[PDB]
Amino acid sequence: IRCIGIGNRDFIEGMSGGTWVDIVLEHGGCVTVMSNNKPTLDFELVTTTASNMAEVRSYCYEANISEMASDSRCPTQGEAYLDKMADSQFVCKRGYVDRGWGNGCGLFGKGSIVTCAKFTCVKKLTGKSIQPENLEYRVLVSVHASQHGGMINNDTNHQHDKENRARIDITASAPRVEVELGSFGSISMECEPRSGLNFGDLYYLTMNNKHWLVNRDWFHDLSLPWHTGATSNNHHWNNKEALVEFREAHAKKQTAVVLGSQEGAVHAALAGALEAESDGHKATIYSGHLKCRLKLDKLRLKGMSYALCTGAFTFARTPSETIHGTATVELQYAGEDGPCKVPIVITSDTNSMASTGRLITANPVVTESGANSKMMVEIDPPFGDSYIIVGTGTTKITHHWHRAGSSIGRAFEATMRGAKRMAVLGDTAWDFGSVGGMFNSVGKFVHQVFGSAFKALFGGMSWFTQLLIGFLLIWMGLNARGGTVAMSFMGIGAMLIFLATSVS
Amino acid sequence: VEVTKKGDTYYMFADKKDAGKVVTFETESGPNRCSIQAMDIGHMCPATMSYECPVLEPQYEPEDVDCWCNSTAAWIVYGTCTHKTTGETRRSRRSITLPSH
Amino acid sequence: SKYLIKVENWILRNPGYALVAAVIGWTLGSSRSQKIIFVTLLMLVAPAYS
Ligand SMILES: *[C@@H]1O[C@H](CO)[C@@H](O)[C@H](O)[C@H]1NC(C)=O
């Protein structure tokens, strides 16, 4: 039920006998996977986690100085000298100043003056690199089990039945994971962290308990003291003169000063930069998509063997409508019959009693055996006007529903979305290894690209007329000596035969 | 002010209070009267400015010099900070700018 | 708008009878556009028998 209130929602349907199915997850969207006999699953990607990041370089914005010393020699004495010059922690500058009898010595010429002082970095910022083997994605999996649909369980402490929700950590070390959903069964997932945001031109900047991402060509352009990442208590710095300003000159001395906090300059420069969050030493990124392949072999239903409900069904409120034309129904059941299957039908008139639409939640059932219980289901009403009927006998309830749009419009939109999805799955779509899975792959993707329109167009899914239409089209394409008329017709005929062979 | 000698050279630890007054001490040559005209002198704290100030003949006026003694050249040292708050002046106002992106 | 969706859903519900009526009305026009008008007549009267 985690995929109901999401703007970017897709719909993926696989072949009836097709166990494997590929999907793509975006960091701002969701994926709904449905089948004929399997329960509906909902996949979402929550956060990109970066951990164990190496350090590349560290800058020092605010610094201090101490123990300023100077030494002056006038002409006919050579260059000035100081013992602190050889130390890497003391920075000095040389210069030439005019001297005379007023300064101590006789010859009228300019001398050599040197001035150095200590350098201690009180505050600093750091830069880290990001490697693909460090990334770890987190995907939540929900199951449409006719849950109550109440948003009272935000965290992972409780109110989360372990057979209805699960969390999966996809790592670059082991991309193959086995998910256990309890009574529902087990699934397999193989996700490939590819085609994401490039991490070869990005640096993770940590500064004052805040974090940003910067460009590598810009990180080295900054003019501030720096030093690489070396584990030690005292580090050697380079290019610290950019933070220590020396005065013009003096006949006997030179007084240096240190610049103030450059935090404001960095905050102003990083205005148009991307931001992130961090916990301890780990970082969280909200950008990046993922490609996955699911194997659904041991997944089954939970209430397929249950009986029917002989109690009283009632609506709890007016059924709402989502942006994708889907209708959520919240039912309240009275009676004590235990877990029983919910008899619900969708038709065009109260006397017709003919299924006209499909259900997003397979096998709607009541979860508890209480007297007055509640449940929820999600369905897809047909375009136009429709009637939802719940129950049998003289106690069955009916409700009117309307939905705008056109079937051809939805079919074309779904076809274009499926084509875009198959285009995103450029690599790792087919297998060129052992033979026997190539025909399976071509059938699988032609299904995933054309079934949304096949189900919407070809009548009432009789599965008998469509085979005859395909056969007659194959015959019409066969008895044709002209070029470019037999190949396309035979291809369309085989496509229709296969699409009717799959689930409708 | 404190007067010491470390390695045949005289150091004069002068605090903030002795600012603008002369002081007499003793060297191997004899008595030495040394005047201090430090204008930017501060209180005692780790930030210590130290510079040698030279001997000169009394028949010449000081030019761009704020320390002078007459026995030899004497090394002066004094702290530079404000109100003993353990903080340097750091009043540079360079305002270095960084590229945006 | 109000009637197009209804007749579209009707056509998609039972396409066999609709195609039968269309091919019947196709051969009952004197001109091509006249055949189109004759089949659209059946298309319009299709939802309500009355
Ligand atoms: C330095 O000058 C003072 C000024 O009177 C004098 O008393 C002192 O003897 C001089 N020091 C010498 C000559 O070593």
Author numbering:
A (entry chain A): 1 to 504
B (entry chain B): 1 to 101
C (entry chain C): 120 to 169
Publication excerpt:
The surface of mature, infectious flaviviruses is composed of an icosahedral shell of 90 flat-lying envelope (E) protein dimers, the main target of humoral immunity. In contrast to their mature counterparts, immature virions possess 60 protruding spike-like trimers of precursor membrane (prM)-E complexes (prM3E3). The pr domain of prM binds to E, obscuring the fusion peptide and thereby preventing unproductive fusion within the already infected cell. When immature virions reach the low-pH environment of the trans-Golgi network (TGN), the trimeric prM3E3 spikes rearrange into the flat-lying conformation, characteristic of the mature virus.
We obtained a 4.2 Å resolution map of the prM3E3 trimer and 3.8 Å resolution for monomeric prM1E1 composing the trimeric spikes. In the structure, the pr domain sits on top of the E protein, covering the fusion loop and burying a combined total surface area of ~3100 Å2. The RSRR furin recognition motif, which is critical for maturation, is found towards the end of the pr domain. Polar interactions between E residues (in particular Glu62 and Glu245) and positively charged residues on pr fix the position of the furin site. Furthermore, hydrophobic prM residues (Ile96 and Leu98) directly downstream of the furin site, bury into the surface of E, providing additional stabilization. The pr domain of prM connects to the membrane-associated M domain via a linker region encompassing residues 102–119. No density is observable for this region, possibly indicating high conformational dynamics. However, the last clearly visible residue prior to this flexible region is a histidine (His101), which is inserted in a hydrophobic pocket on E. Although the prM sequence is relatively diverse compared with that of E, His101 is highly conserved. A decrease in pH would lead to protonation of His101, destabilizing this residue in the hydrophobic pocket and promoting prM-E dissociation.
